[PDB]
């Protein structure tokens, strides 16, 4: 993972909003350096004029040595695919979406755009006049990865084009695609609601809501009146999306816990771990401390939320070295983070930290067993899904463009 200065993250952010967000880091900084002296005249042709302008004004304030409150933006490149690649240990899927580095023949690490890669592969094999629009394909890809079957049937028909689309996905992301296949067959036809707990204790409840259509006559012409009602259904197409979105939800909560932390709390937990804390105990802490530690054991995902429940008695049920290791992996100075589900914003002098923390979380998901842990609660019995490459997480730690 290469690092950048705070001013460089400003450069990248302004380039992004111009925007060259699919270019490599150095091409982005080179574009900036080239146009630094003319930025305000470029506002009318930037893709995001207002954010570009906010960024340019921040850069000027930084030149003058003025303090700034402006936060730069780093986006997940295909959040969903990243999470599914990590859950399944799918090295091929990982290379589509910057979970691990991809190098061209030159050997440069490239900022990959999964939708473009699969679109090219599809024209390359479909050949001979392929009647398919690039943006309609991205819609088909991203809705498919979240479990949609209706949207690919609309972009690709139900014939040979659909066949080529599914064949392409199965070579480019075999385990991701197999898992999506599997989620379809995981519904319970008797269930009114699905429930699972995330490793940081968030309880997910999905009520099963089905269409009830009352038909009505108004001037002797018919009108169908459809209202969502709680019920059951034979199949269900929702599980892949809801499970995957619950995981990006978790990544948001945990990234913010690790970045925007209370320094006085951190030092208390450090003393507590080293036997130096004044005695303090509350019986109410025990249940939650046990619950969260258990999720770590079953999943590999240790949440910094546990700091809230560690005291003189409760530290006894955890491994103090794991608690200290987590704290040591956090940024040396805390910072605020604004999040738009899979967009992340912070002051640019924390750019390096936010990317290190995102990498750590993806690597944790890749290394561990969160998928089995969640699938077991969804289907009502212990299942185990294996990693397709159990070492993928090692490469995840060092990946370059997970956030770009």
């Amino acid at each position: 993972m290469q690092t950048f200065t705070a001013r460089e993250y400003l450069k990248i952010d302004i380039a992004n909003n111009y925007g060259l967000d699919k270019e490599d880091w150095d091409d982005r900084i080179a574009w900036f350096d080239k146009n630094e002296n003319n930025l305000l005249n470029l506002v009318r042709e930037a893709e995001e004029p207002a954010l570009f302008y906010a960024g340019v004004k921040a850069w000027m304030d930084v030149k003058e040595g003025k303090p700034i409150g402006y936060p730069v933006a780093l986006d997940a490149t295909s959040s969903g695919l990243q999470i599914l690649a990590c859950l399944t240990g799918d090295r091929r899927a990982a290379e589509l979406c910057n979970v691990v580095n991809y190098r061209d023949e030159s050997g440069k690490v490239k900022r990959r755009d999964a939708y473009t890669v699969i679109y090219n592969k599809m024209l390359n094999t479909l050949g001979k006049g392929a009647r398919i629009k690039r943006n309609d394909c991205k819609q088909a890809i991203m809705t498919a990865l979240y479990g949609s079957e209706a949207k690919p049937k609309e972009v690709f028909g139900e014939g040979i084009m659909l066949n080529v689309f599914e064949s392409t996905m199965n070579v480019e992301a075999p385990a991701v695609w197999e898992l999506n296949k599997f989620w379809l067959q995981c519904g319970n036809p008797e269930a009114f609601v699905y429930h699972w707990v995330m490793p940081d204790g968030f309880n997910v409840y999905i009520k099963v809501m089905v269409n009830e259509v009352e038909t009505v006559h108004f001037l002797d012409k018919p009108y169908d009146c459809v209202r969502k009602v709680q019920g059951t259904e034979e199949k269900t197409r929702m599980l892949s999306a809801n499970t995957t979105h619950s995981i990006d939800g978790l990544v948001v909560r945990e990234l913010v816990r690790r970045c925007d932390y209370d320094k006085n709390q951190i030092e208390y937990i450090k003393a507590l771990c080293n036997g130096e804390a004044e005695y303090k105990a509350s019986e109410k802490n025990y249940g939650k401390a046990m619950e969260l530690w258990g999720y770590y054991e079953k999943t590999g995902f240790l949440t910094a939320r546990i700091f809230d429940y560690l005291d003189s008695e409760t530290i006894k049920l955890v491994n103090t070295q794991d608690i200290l290791d987590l704290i040591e992996s956090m940024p040396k100075k805390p910072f605020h983070v604004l999040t738009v589900h899979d967009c992340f914003r912070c002051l640019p002098n924390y750019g390096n930290d936010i990317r290190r923390q995102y990498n750590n979380l993806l690597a944790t998901i890749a290394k561990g067993d969160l998928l089995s842990f969640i699938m077991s609660q969804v289907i009502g019995q212990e299942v185990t899904i294996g990693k397709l490459d159990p070492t993928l997480w090692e490469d995840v730690l060092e990946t370059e463009y997970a956030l770009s």
Binding site: K57, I68, G69, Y70, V216, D248, R253, N349
Partner: protein
């Protein structure tokens, strides 16, 4: 003083709940006596007021849309559509069979519409939001609805710690960007479809009507404030508000910055 201002802001929000505030325009503020009139034509009072309100909101509405909002008043979907025929024939609003829609006749004043446009959506808080300790209450001092978005309540653990951590980030408005957007966004917004674009143009014009007034009122006691945050049932986190929000529209994101500025190096 800011505590007082916060109480003023919540008072404005509570007085401008969309549907209860509209009903007032048809009940205690109408010259028309809808109570007397709805009795006359035999239409249940609460149903009729509600139908009038929905038409003043929607302006135009197909039949399934209008019965949907009103379905809970009758044991049958059919009863709702009948009541709607009875009201359209008595000139409460018109139905045009050639476009299959109801068209409004009686709409609320522009002055009341301007207040609803300013205050019906939650605003940032100008004091630290209340610490959340149960799954009710969203940070304000006077709301105690379920913190989870839509009808998805549980009293199980939903990581209040995350909401409490986001809610205390102090934010402020960058007036330099805010003035640039107002002066220049309409002639910068080049056609990005062609029905979706003419839709984003309207969305900005509505926003531009009230944003500066709201931003000015908001920061009356100082340029520093806090957004409240709510989880959906999946655990995605949403910051709450229309005029000031770092989620949502690009002209909205641009104006927000951290209140604790820093010398970058």
């Amino acid at each position: 003083s800011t505590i007082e201002h916060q109480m003023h802001l919540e008072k404005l929000y509570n007085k401008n709940q969309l549907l209860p505030r509209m009903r007032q325009e048809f009940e205690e503020n109408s010259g028309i006596d809808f109570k007397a009139f709805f009795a006359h034509i035999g239409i249940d009072y609460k149903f009729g007021i509600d139908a009038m309100v929905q038409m003043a909101l929607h302006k135009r509405a197909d039949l399934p849309t209008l019965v949907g909002t009103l379905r809970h008043h009758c044991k049958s979907a059919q009863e709702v559509a009948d009541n709607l025929f009875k009201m359209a024939s008595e000139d409460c609003f018109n139905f045009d069979p050639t476009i299959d829609k109801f068209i409004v006749i009686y709409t609320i004043s522009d002055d009341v519409q301007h207040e609803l446009d300013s205050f019906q959506y939650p605003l940032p808080m100008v004091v630290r939001p209340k610490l959340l300790t149960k799954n009710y209450g969203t940070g304000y001092f006077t709301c105690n609805k379920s913190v989870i978005l839509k009808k998805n309540h549980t009293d199980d653990d939903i990581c209040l710690d995350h909401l409490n951590r986001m809610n205390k980030i102090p934010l402020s408005i960058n007036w330099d960007v805010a003035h640039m957007v107002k002066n220049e966004w309409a002639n910068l917004d080049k056609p990005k479809t062609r029905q979706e674009f003419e839709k984003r143009v309207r969305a900005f014009q509505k926003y531009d009507r009230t944003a500066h007034e709201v931003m000015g009122l908001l920061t009356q006691e100082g340029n520093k404030f806090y957004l409240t945050h709510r989880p959906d049932k999946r655990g995605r986190t949403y910051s709450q508000g229309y005029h000031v929000n770092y989620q949502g529209t690009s002209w909205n994101k641009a104006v927000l910055e951290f209140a604790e500025k820093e010398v970058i190096d």
